[PDB]
């Protein structure tokens, strides 16, 4: 593989699970704790991760997971992290369903300027029906319309980001000419979902414009991403389903005129790395055991895994399934390597809900990849595009 592998670090505060917070190692306030977020981001930056990633949602109930009940908004925390990090990209989830594209176009570009070219947007059409009810609507649009809207939203957002050319801001104190009037472009969009005259009140960043990520996994979703995205997040249920998605998407991107190396595909994994197989397994177990089994049985009570498993352990493994990427550094490194060479992945988003994981990944797994020529020895540069391998538009 000509290219290197890449990593992004998802920072999800107190984690993606109903009871993982109960572990002794976990700060149950992590989700609103600036320190937690800073240390993580600096660890990822130490491991030369290309970006940190913040996921997001806009609706809760009292049965939502603890993280979702009380956490940072994405652009605030990324902007804060911007000032205490040097090269790592800053990618954040924003819905096309609720915000005005001007508002968002601005906040992302502003981030991009603050950070000297490290912004990314995880564009998300947004699934929670109750979200509508937090934003003065009755209901979400139906799924297909959702993606129609997103196309228009993005197109406006990208239009605005091109309000100014890279060299518009001339700043001639002698002539009193601040900017070149020819290099300023009014969008004048009057579309179906949005009307936006422009121009945007901030110009081009050291990487041009932020990088687009996209999560979408449906037929519609893959097409959209294949068409519009610089990078795609996907799941990692298995090597083969992930090889499939990769194939399909890189194909559809060719069908849209695009060079497929221009689209980077990033499945999400949460490695549990330890010095021995039995330590890693301990850790898995401490966490899997945190759920009250009473809960766990029920959600089970709506595969063949008679592997000497008791009902309890099967109820537990449902609550908190075990990653393939468990165990020794070389095992984890090796899977990661195999997935890459198989063309299931161009890189991975690393979750690190369990305490120590992110730190252990960076410390033990990265050096191996570096040492086998699979991962760089230092940051390519200071923008998210340089580091990702993408060209400035």
When binding is defined by CB under 6 A, the residue of 108, 154, 212, 215 that contacts ligand FMN is 215
Q: 68 or 284: whose CB is closer to a second copy?
A: 68
Neighbour-count burial of 22, counting CB atoms closer than 10 A to its CB (0-12 exposed, 13-18 middle, 19+ buried): middle
Q: 48 or 225: whose CB is closer to ligand FMN?
A: 225
- Is 166 annotated as belonging to a binding site? no
When binding is defined by CB under 6 A, the residue of 93, 96, 162, 316 that contacts ligand FMN is 93
Q: 68 or 284: whose CB is closer to ligand FMN?
A: 68
The reply to whether 31 sits near ligand FMN by the rule CB under 6 A is no
Judged by beta carbon distances under 5 to 8 A according to partner kind, the member of ligand GLC, a second copy, ligand FMN, none in contact with residue 235 is ligand FMN
Q: Which residue is nearest to ligand GLC, using beta carbons?
A: 57
- Is 147 annotated as belonging to a binding site? yes
CB 113 to a second copy: min, Å:
5
Buried b / exposed e over 25-50, threshold 16 CB at 10 Å, is ebeeebbebeebbbebbbbbbebbbb
Q: 189 or 258: whose CB is closer to a second copy?
A: 189
Q: 217 or 262: whose CB is closer to ligand GLC?
A: 217
Judged by beta carbon distances under 5 to 8 A according to partner kind, the member of ligand FMN, a second copy, ligand GLC, none in contact with residue 218 is ligand FMN
CB 266 to a second copy: min, Å:
25
- Token readout for 46 is 């130490």
Q: 181 or 377: whose CB is closer to a second copy?
A: 181
- Token readout for 130 is 């109750």
| Interatomic CA distance for residues 78 and 117, integer angstroms | 13
CB 132 to a second copy: min, Å:
9
Judged by beta carbon distances under 5 to 8 A according to partner kind, the member of ligand FMN, a second copy, ligand GLC, none in contact with residue 28 is a second copy
- Is 56 annotated as belonging to a binding site? yes
Q: Which stretch binds ligand FMN (CB under 6 A): 14-22, 77-85, 230-238, 310-318?
A: 230-238
Neighbour-count burial of 152, counting CB atoms closer than 10 A to its CB (0-12 exposed, 13-18 middle, 19+ buried): middle
| Interatomic CA distance for residues 97 and 127, integer angstroms | 10
- Token readout for 361 is 């990944």
- Is 299 annotated as belonging to a binding site? no
CB 16 to a second copy: min, Å:
14
Residues 36 to 55 in contact with ligand FMN, rule: CB under 6 A: 55
Binding site for ligand GLC (CB under 6 A): 55-57, 68, 127-128
Provide CB contacts within 8 A for 112, sequence distance 6+.
118, 119, 205, 206, 207, 209, 210
Judged by beta carbon distances under 5 to 8 A according to partner kind, the member of ligand FMN, a second copy, ligand GLC, none in contact with residue 307 is none
SS3 state at 155:
helix
Q: 178 or 312: whose CB is closer to ligand GLC?
A: 178
- Beta strands 347-350 and 264-269 are parallel
Q: Which residue is nearest to ligand FMN, using beta carbons?
A: 221
Asked if 51 and 6 touch (Cβ cutoff 8 Å), the reply is no
- Is 218 annotated as belonging to a binding site? yes
The reply to whether 16 sits near ligand FMN by the rule CB under 6 A is no
Residue indicated by tokens 């990661």: 336
Q: Where are the beta strands (DSSP E) in the chain?
A: 6-10, 51-54, 89-95, 119-124, 189-190, 195-196, 211-214, 231-234, 264-269, 272-273, 326-327, 347-350
Phi, psi of 159 (to 5 degrees): -45, -55
Phi, psi of 366 (to 5 degrees): -60, -50
| Interatomic CA distance for residues 169 and 158, integer angstroms | 19
Q: Max alpha carbon distance in the chain (Å)? A: 82
In sequence order, the β-bridge partners of residue 326 are 272
Judged by beta carbon distances under 5 to 8 A according to partner kind, the member of ligand GLC, a second copy, ligand FMN, none in contact with residue 79 is a second copy
Residues 262 to 301 in contact with ligand FMN, rule: CB under 6 A: 268
Binding residues for FMN: 56, 93, 143, 147, 217-218
Binding region for ligand FMN (CB under 6 A) = 55-57, 93, 122, 124-127, 215-218, 220-221, 233-235, 268, 349
């Amino acid at each position: 593989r000509a290219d290197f592998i890449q990593f992004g670090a998802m920072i999800h505060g107190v984690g993606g699970t109903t009871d993982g917070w109960r572990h002794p190692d976990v700060d149950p306030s992590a989700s609103t704790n600036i320190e937690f977020y800073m240390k993580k981001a600096q660890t990822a930056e130490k491991g030369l991760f290309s970006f940190i990633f913040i996921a997001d949602g806009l609706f809760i109930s009292e049965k939502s997971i603890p993280h979702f009940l009380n956490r940072f908004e994405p652009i605030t925390i990324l902007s804060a992290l911007a000032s205490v990090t040097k090269n790592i990209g800053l990618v954040g989830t924003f819905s096309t369903s609720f915000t005005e594209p001007f508002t968002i176009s601005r906040q992302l570009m502003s981030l991009d300027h603050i950070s000297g070219g490290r912004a990314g947007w995880n564009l998300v059409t947004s699934p929670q029906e109750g979200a509508a009810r937090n934003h003065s609507k009755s209901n979400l649009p139906e799924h297909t319309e959702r993606y129609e809207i997103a196309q228009e939203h993005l197109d406006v957002v990208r239009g605005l980001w091109n309000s100014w050319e890279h060299d518009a801001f001339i700043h001639n104190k002698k002539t009193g000419q601040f900017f070149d009037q020819a290099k300023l472009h009014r969008l004048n969009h009057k579309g179906k979902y949005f009307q936006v005259e422009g121009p945007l009140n901030i110009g081009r960043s050291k990487q041009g414009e932020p990088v687009v990520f996209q999560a979408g996994s449906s037929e519609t979703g893959r097409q959209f991403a294949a068409k519009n995205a610089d990078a795609i997040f996907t799941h990692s249920n298995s090597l083969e389903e992930t090889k499939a998605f990769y194939a399909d998407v890189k194909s559809r991107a060719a069908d849209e005129g695009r060079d497929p190396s221009s689209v980077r595909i990033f499945p999400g994994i949460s490695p549990i790395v330890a010095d021995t197989e039995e330590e890693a397994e301990k850790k898995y177990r401490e966490f899997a055991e945190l759920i009250p089994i009473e809960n766990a049985v029920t959600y089970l009570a709506r595969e063949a895994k008679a592997r000497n498993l008791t009902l309890r352990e099967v109820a537990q493994e449902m609550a908190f399934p075990r990653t393939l990427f468990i165990g020794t550094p070389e095992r984890v490194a090796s899977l990661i390597e195999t997935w890459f060479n198989a063309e299931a992945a161009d890189g991975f988003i690393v979750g690190s809900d369990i305490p120590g994981t992110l730190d252990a990944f960076v410390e033990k797994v990265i050096p191996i990849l570096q040492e086998r020529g699979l991962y760089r020895q230092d940051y390519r540069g200071g923008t998210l595009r340089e580091n990702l391998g993408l060209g400035i538009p």
